[PDB]
Swiss-Prot record:
UniProt-recorded name of the protein: Serine/threonine-protein phosphatase 5
Modification after translation (UniProt): Activated by at least two different proteolytic cleavages producing a 56 kDa and a 50 kDa form.
Complete-protein stretch covered: 175 to 490 of 499
Domain of life: Eukaryota
Species in which this protein is naturally found: Homo sapiens (Human)
Known regulation of activity: Autoinhibited. In the autoinhibited state, the TPR domain interacts with the catalytic region and prevents substrate access to the catalytic pocket. Allosterically activated by various polyunsaturated fatty acids, free long-chain fatty-acids and long-chain fatty acyl-CoA esters, arachidonic acid being the most effective activator. HSP90A and probably RAC1, GNA12 and GNA13 can also release the autoinhibition by the TPR repeat. Activation by RAC1, GNA12 and GNA13 is synergistic with the one produced by fatty acids binding. Inhibited by okadaic acid.
């Protein structure tokens, strides 16, 4: 009979979380009832959030922004080692793509949902293009959840992903979204805020752009090699920032050898938190510090740490909308 982590009277606690991270580090399984309790509870928390989360960072406060983690659970642990566990005084934003590709997707997403419950005002989760059924059917997550639990557990994951916020704006000055900006000029923050987000993202339009677009160095917009949305130039970014009174945007969605990249003259930052991506890329990863007194990004790089012998995509021309390879 089950000897693993249990909720303390239907409630997530710091000892539950520490127990949980140990239990996963040793490759064991959270009991499906507990998985179930966490899912329905984060669904209630996330459903009450705005599509655009607006947060104020006081002068002396900082926040940490992470990018793609893609089921690399042991690197997630290393982030919390390097940068401290989440708390009221150590807030976090995870900019999407917590799942798919890596073979510890379930470990990652339950760990991130448990902290969302423990510290709902300091631990933030934004939807990526991989928190959708489309990508999960292809890139391993649906498979992982079916091997470890049931198809019914998976449908509950899908429901919860539909409540993830799409963007976060800090101090009216920094906009964070997973993918990037838009295929038409003139989108406003109020437009974002009014997106009805609890759905699968469509083919085209603002919700799709926010999850799928990429920056390009030359001016203009180009048809995307991903099959939806577009590539946007420096001119697209400048006009967006100026209409919305913002300093710059932070985004994720693209592997980088240095763990990050600063494009469009400073205006468009990529942060990527999955080191040696897919056990293939050999890249560094990074996370960003932002200070309330000083919203310029501080980049902290880091390298991959060991994990169990479980190859990536282990649970995974005519499929459409592609992440780039892996
Ligand atoms: Mn992505
Ligand atoms: Mn990704």
């Amino acid at each position: 009979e089950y000897s693993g982590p249990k909720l303390e009277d239907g409630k997530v606690t710091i000892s539950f979380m520490k127990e949980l991270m140990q239990w996963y580090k040793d490759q064991k399984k959270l009991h499906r009832k507990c998985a179930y309790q966490i899912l329905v509870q984060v669904k209630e928390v996330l459903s009450k959030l705005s599509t655009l989360v607006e947060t104020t960072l006081k002068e002396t406060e900082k926040i940490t922004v992470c990018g793609d983690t893609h089921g690399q659970f042991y690197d997630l642990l290393n982030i919390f080692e390097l940068n401290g566990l989440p708390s009221e005084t150590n807030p976090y934003i995870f900019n999407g793509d917590f799942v798919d590709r890596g073979s510890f997707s379930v470990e990652v997403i339950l760990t991130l949902f448990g902290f969302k419950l423990l510290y709902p005002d300091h631990f933030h989760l934004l939807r990526g293009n991989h928190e959708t059924d489309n990508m999960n059917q292809i890139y391993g997550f649906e498979g992982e959840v079916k091997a470890k639990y049931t198809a019914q557990m998976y449908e509950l994951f899908s429901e919860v992903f539909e409540w993830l916020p799409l963007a976060q704006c800090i101090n009216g000055k920094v906009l964070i979204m997973h993918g990037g900006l838009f295929s038409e000029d003139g989108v406003t923050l109020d437009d974002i805020r009014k997106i009805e987000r609890n759905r699968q993202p469509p083919d085209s339009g603002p919700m799709c752009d926010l999850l799928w677009s990429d920056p390009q160095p030359q001016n203009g917009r180009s048809i995307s090699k991903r099959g939806v949305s577009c590539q946007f130039g420096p001119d697209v970014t400048k006009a967006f920032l100026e209409e919305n009174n913002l300093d710059y945007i932070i985004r994720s969605h693209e592997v980088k050898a240095e763990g990050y990249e600063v494009a469009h003259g400073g205006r468009c930052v990529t942060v990527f938190s999955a080191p040696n991506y897919c056990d293939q890329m050999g890249n560094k990863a990074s996370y960003i510090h932002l200070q309330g007194s000083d919203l310029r990004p501080q980049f902290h790089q880091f390298t991959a740490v060991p994990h169990p012998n479980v190859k990536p995509m282990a649970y995974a021309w005519d499929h459409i909308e592609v992440e780039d390879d892996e």
